[PDB]
Design a binder for this molecule. Structure first.
Ligand code: FES
Ligand code: FES
Ligand code: FES
Ligand SMILES: [Fe+3]
Ligand SMILES: [Fe+3]
Ligand SMILES: [Fe+3]
Lengths: 444, 192, 444, 192, 444, 192
């Protein structure tokens, strides 16, 4: 079945989806096998032979820089008895030996040496049929390398749909980003969708959940404490895509959630570059560069421009996920500003992050209650801003709503989520999505 | 005394630190540092964060908790950064943290959280160049329970620098903690 | 299916019911959604605005005193994204705010205040359709408040059936009881039914299991040590009801399980009232007052009169329950005798209680063995006293057997258990229990 | 020294206790109390309960372990009782308890149970009005394993009063533990 | 279904079999309910009344020496409310009392005494119909006692098939073995089949996995370090049976994995007996005695001759097993050599054993990966030596391969495993093993 | 002082040891043994195994860690062996063990493993016959984390004999550990 978990236009969703164990199993087939997933950045596997390990849903893959400058990714599972081969998170290897029996693999996945081949294996083994299981699709977006196990998938840039347009001022026209490793890693007891859903456009929560650190850290976001006064019309927007990804835009808040010790230099530098950009890119897009995006690229990759955080919510089980937390920096920032901003991302939304801790109270109980008999068929509502959404604005790229405090990317996400969840392939997903912008504006 | 050429598994850092201690046999200094670490751990347990910061934390403080990336033991070419800074705070950043805890709308702290912490394996040595300085090593288990059936236990070794203050006090200058689990088991919003 | 797990007249039952995970899922539908469950006492939420939190099976509700003196209970889940609203066990509130986005609710379940309603929600939100999920039926028994999620349920006093009659000397005619909070809270790895069945009428175990403190504390129960000599016929009886609830009556044992330091005063005080009660209520019923009932109100609320304990076995999963432990005191006891008896209930069957720990050895392994291949379809026997049971005694109302050492309530309990487990609603249970007294009295 | 008006999270109780300690620097007293707590935990670990009660426990003892109910930190009206007494024993009640343990038909103690106790963070101060009395604070991890794969760990802070007696001994008059988990993870039939 | 989990000739098997939770449940029915399982040895329950408790899959049985010298085994569960009766691992008992209500059992499983029988039970209890659930089939092999819950099972000796022959020089003609208790007990997070398969014939790993202690302990196995150079063929063989059990034979390595402190005396002693044995049993079979077998008696009992270890991989769940580790000694060894060898087996393959520790790294991840989406339907290969095995060699009895570094016993093992997994009784398994040797030699 | 006739649950062994300690009050000796045991736990934490073996372990060492089988408390007839030797090592056997750890192909040690260990409840007494000898009792929690999300914690009491050697050292001659969980929770390839 799995139909009718999210209603028409993505307006409600069954609470059970943040807890049911049967469905989490379905998701591994239908969400994380099918869609694009964040692996790493060029900045962390630069020289040939550099490798990292990264999770693709439940599966762990090895991501290796090729000698021809390429990148390819294989399962960190052996072809013999199935042991795990590489137990380092990162490194640089002339090859990968699996120390159960000694099988030798190329940095390119080929089975290159099996001990005692001539003696014991003879005719029963042929090394060209025993390569690591290869990730078929690997493409890139201004340094950020993404994998997918389904080869029928739309190319990365198409998959990113109308959200790419907003990312480009910060991911491209800034000169580009490098990612600062290693990432922070923590367990929080919450289904992965709860963070995806928070980051795809939960600005509603900033004034209340985060009321303490706004008062005490004096983020550029303090004009929201207590959910008292929203910043007036001239606040921002929120946007969603055909392929699920969405984001909320908050004008000129380049310093994001950072505390007053950094707010000066961050806004100095980012206003400086904004002038340069506007001559090259124009007024709207140069401002977007210096504004604050929070968004989720489907299914489980989130970023914060300005705040400069890159998260991946790696699924463990229906009520647990593993949270990786990198900082990204614009390449032409001074090294000391890079250092300061790399730490500050951790201090904010890392393992010891006071923003992410406040946030986990909501995310944990959100999913605990999903398991309870009387609340599992309850309907969660994402109605905030509904009916004020529009397609084909002369100036703004996707399906757009008029505040960052909206739930327009919420319905976008769970529209796509439900579309993947009930469909057997990419072919069927497209057939449930021909009318995707119409579905989400509807009656209006 | 440790020979790193024979003792194949020892870090250069781990070895340089081991050679500071267990040489001079100063009972006075040990009773001092025990009072210090205990008073500090007592203050953090009853959530007296302001007093901790004012009396225990020296203003030039570096407060660092790192998460090291798992490399091969044979790695000789990969040179990108070793470690994330879970915590890397100066006094102002700590002050924000303390002020965050005490703020009346800090939702996670209603009902009051229970912290109990166990401090063992303490040793100390005077720095040879600047004798006002004190190297102190201590191990810590931290028990954190809240909302009935939520519990989290942390284990950590803390390499500490403490300096003698003019008023007769002693305050913390540097804390380095290499937190030993790579994936932290829960969100470490606590002072180690 | 789930038919044929407990046999005719409840004589045997398949051991798997204390471990099977699918079945525990069914029970949440057919047992805890359907039947009355203990919430709290008037004595713990007395003034208006006073609230406590209580588990109703897996679901957690807020149970709140209304201004008009009434009591209502709502799911401690939010109507927006489903966060948990109240994180305190007790308090007194002018309303309940959910600190994810700030939605404010009345002590009456109504959604009263939404941040930025005019700006962001406008017509997409109503507020009158977004009240907390309210438990439909709440009723009372001399201060003890029970909730139920099925509105088709029989009234509480009827549901209590032939059991009310035994309870009234201690629950009504004593002047009434107040409950002493807070409760003790502990986990024990055992299915909730194992305590239900123990408290519904296991007097058989006292002489052997509890041989240790009987010797050492001098409970008024010492005449059972070693299961050597039963107190002669003139010991007591056991009773069961149409709606599952049952108990074992043991004549004149007002103090024990309590130890000899308390035994004098408890028996002194309770003999005093027994005279006075006898003038008003008669010889038999005044004796019941000073006697000892151990019993379970279906499905998971157990009590001990005289010993003065009130338990609730809160289900967690198939092999875990959360055990809450209050003392109840007679309102007209002196303050020091109330104090002493409240502590002494904890010392005996609380978290640090020497009676309940001895008993957990039996309860844990009892349910661990249910999971084992060769024992899961084995048959547990509740045959003790079978065939000496009778209905419609000239004095004693329920289905009654001739010793407190019986298993008459066991079969009573599991007969009703099977009745719920196999039926889709309250109507069907009634149709399977038309002949309930005939079934358990059977052949004799 | 703690100001509760500034240090918003601190208990009235927690502050009054903290002000007893870390003032006097009495090394004699600290070794006395260390020997005391260690011997007592030794006796309880090898299950020498009779010896504990007759030598370590004074006859006037109050032995209290409470479980505090979770209120809101902004709570200002709800005044019903705060705490259950998991333990609140006078000498005779303890006697029944220890005698329960030694009894040969005590089924849960076959096979013999394993207790291991870890005691840290000990500090003490002489009471000012009655100098025979000794205020003593200690933290405790208790490891309890039995029947192969059953294991339970308890963590607790214990606020103690000890009194100096006749032959030079010292016995326990008051032991108060605010047990920090609200839902206990398993039944606490042990002396903390 | 569960067909097609192991391919034809046991050549491949789906990786999911070391993780799938439904399957482990099926295994309790079709594998551990059906086949022979190690209980204990004569040397540990010798006198009448001596008993131990031992696991039979999940079920725990009590194994008791009878007064007539017999041996019988019963479920460690009671017939009344299902408590566990005996909580000791070993002892000597006049009977078994269950301390819930006091029911008393004989060492023969019969219910011997019920408290208050005449008073409270009367006719409702027959007593003779309430004996412990008894293991129907228990047989012996030169001191080693095995149980089975299926009575249609073939005798133990037949079940041991062509493997008894290789075992007999050490189990029989040595004068016989005594087993040294108590066993070591440890949990390791790995499915049991990984240890079964490792021990049925993984010599391929000794040179690489175990490279470090070979260099440092100088076992008689050092001529394998680095998987550099195999001892020429004149090395050993490997063998498999119709009923699953198999082993790998390595000539003249009597002091197996042991470190140089013992190696002199063990090889001295074992060569002495080798002289005498050859006059009694002949050249080939007396060599086997002083050679090294590693093998698994189906499904979950493994041994190491020469190294002198007796393991049992007890299932707990799909990804956890409990590993018992006894030493066996040849009865006519000196007391001090028994001492040394008893410790040294623990030092090697015990809880703190450096051989089994290295090996657990392989076993843990081997089975962790079985749970991952992209790896659960991957194929494990057991192709080492395939096509070089033969039947009815008229010296070497079973299906035999020309190196101990082979995987012939793998396919033997996984052929029987697949045969049980797809069949409802022993009858059906036999019909799937009519051509068992043909299947395994087939294409050559 | 323990009467085993009254105190039903005490081992004759557990009692014979309890009577060594807490009689003499030697603060000099206690500072010695604390320096000793901490230094050793430090060395094992930084994986400086070679130095531990050369400097801390005497050549005559008996290093024993047993797992006792679960008997009935009323058992009076069954006389087979009581206990497995998880560890029962002399110097040469430990040397192999140490050398196994340092070996570059010891796969389980890549990436490097993190050990942190907490030592509490320390007491010591001079042997009355041979004053060269030192009886030492200490409790130990050992934390072992590796490969991200794998953690194992061990709890144990260590009954020690330490001997004064002529070079001015003090080394370990006997370690006895009765490891209190019967089914070990993970493979105990660690030194307690
Ligand atoms: S499993 Fe990779 S070595 Fe065979
Ligand atoms: S979920 Fe309660 S405020 Fe939105
Ligand atoms: S369960 Fe064995 S005595 Fe009733
Ligand atoms: Fe947030
Ligand atoms: Fe009981
Ligand atoms: Fe091996």
């Amino acid at each position: 079945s799995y139909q009718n978990l999210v209603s028409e236009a993505g307006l409600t969703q069954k609470h059970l989806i943040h807890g049911d164990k049967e469905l989490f199993q379905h998701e591994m087939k239908t969400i994380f096998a099918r869609n694009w997933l964040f692996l790493t950045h060029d900045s962390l596997i630069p020289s040939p032979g550099d490798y990292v390990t990264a999770k693709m849903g439940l599966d762990e893959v090895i991501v290796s820089r090729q000698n021809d400058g390429s990148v390819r990714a294989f399962l960190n599972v052996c072809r013999h008895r199935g042991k795990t081969i590489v137990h380092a998170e990162a490194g640089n290897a002339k090859g990968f030996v699996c120390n159960y029996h000694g099988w030798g693999y190329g940095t390119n996945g080929e089975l290159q040496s099996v001990p005692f081949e001539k003696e014991l294996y003879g005719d029963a083994i042929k090394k060209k049929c025993l390569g690591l299981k290869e990730v078929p699709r690997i493409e890139s977006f201004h340094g950020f390398i993404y994998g997918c196990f389904d080869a029928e998938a739309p190319p990365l840039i198409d998959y990113l749909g109308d959200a790419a347009w907003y990312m480009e001022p910060t991911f491209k026209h800034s000169g580009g980003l490098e990612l600062v490793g290693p990432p922070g890693k923590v367990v929080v007891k919450a289904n992965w969708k709860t963070f995806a859903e928070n980051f795809v456009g939960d600005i509603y929560h900033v004034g209340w959940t985060h009321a303490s650190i706004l008062r005490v850290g004096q983020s550029v976001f303090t004009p929201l404490a207590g959910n008292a006064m929203l910043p007036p019309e001239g606040s921002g927007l929120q946007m969603t895509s055909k392929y699920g990804s969405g984001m909320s835009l908050m004008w000129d808040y380049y310093a994001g959630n950072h505390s007053a010790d950094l707010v000066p230099d961050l806004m100095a530098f980012g206003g400086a570059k904004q002038e340069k950009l506007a001559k090259e890119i124009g007024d709207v897009r140069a401002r977007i560069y210096r504004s604050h995006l929070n968004g989720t690229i489907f299914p489980n990759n989130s970023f914060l421009t300005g705040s400069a955080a890159f998260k991946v919510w790696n699924p463990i089980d229906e009520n647990t996920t593993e949270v990786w937390t990198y900082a990204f920096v614009e390449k032409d920032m001074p090294e000391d500003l890079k250092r300061r901003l790399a730490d500050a991302v951790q201090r904010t939304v890392g393992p010891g992050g006071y923003w992410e801790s406040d946030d986990n109270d909501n995310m944990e109980t959100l999913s605990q209650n999903a398991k309870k008999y009387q609340s599992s068929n309850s309907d969660l509502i994402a109605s905030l801003g509904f009916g004020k959404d529009v397609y084909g604005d002369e100036c703004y790229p996707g399906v757009v709503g008029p505040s960052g405090a909206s739930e327009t990317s919420y319905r976008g996400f769970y529209r796509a989520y439900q579309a993947h969840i009930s469909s057997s392939n990419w072919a069927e997903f497209e057939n449930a999505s021909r009318n995707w912008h119409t579905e989400l504006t509807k009656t209006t | 005394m440790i020979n790193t050429q024979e003792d194949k598994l020892v870090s250069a850092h781990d070895a340089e630190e081991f050679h500071r201690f267990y040489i001079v046999q100063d009972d006075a200094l040990l009773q001092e540092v025990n009072t210090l670490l205990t008073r500090e751990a007592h203050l953090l347990d009853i959530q007296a964060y302001k007093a901790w910061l004012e009396h225990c934390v020296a203003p030039e403080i570096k407060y660092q908790v790192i998460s090291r990336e798992l490399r091969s033991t044979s790695e000789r070419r990969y040179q990108l950064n070793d470690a994330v800074n879970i915590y890397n705070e100066n006094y102002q950043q700590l002050k924000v943290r303390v002020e965050h805890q005490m703020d009346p709308q800090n939702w996670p702290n209603s009902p009051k959280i229970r912290f109990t912490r166990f401090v063992t394996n303490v040793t100390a040595a005077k720095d040879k160049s600047a004798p006002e300085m004190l190297h102190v090593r201590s191990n810590l288990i931290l028990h954190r329970a809240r909302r009935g059936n939520e519990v989290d236990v942390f284990y950590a070794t803390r390499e500490d620098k403490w300096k003698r203050i003019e008023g007769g006090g002693i305050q913390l200058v540097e804390r380095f903690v290499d937190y030993p689990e790579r994936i932290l088991p829960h969100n470490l919003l606590v002072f180690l």
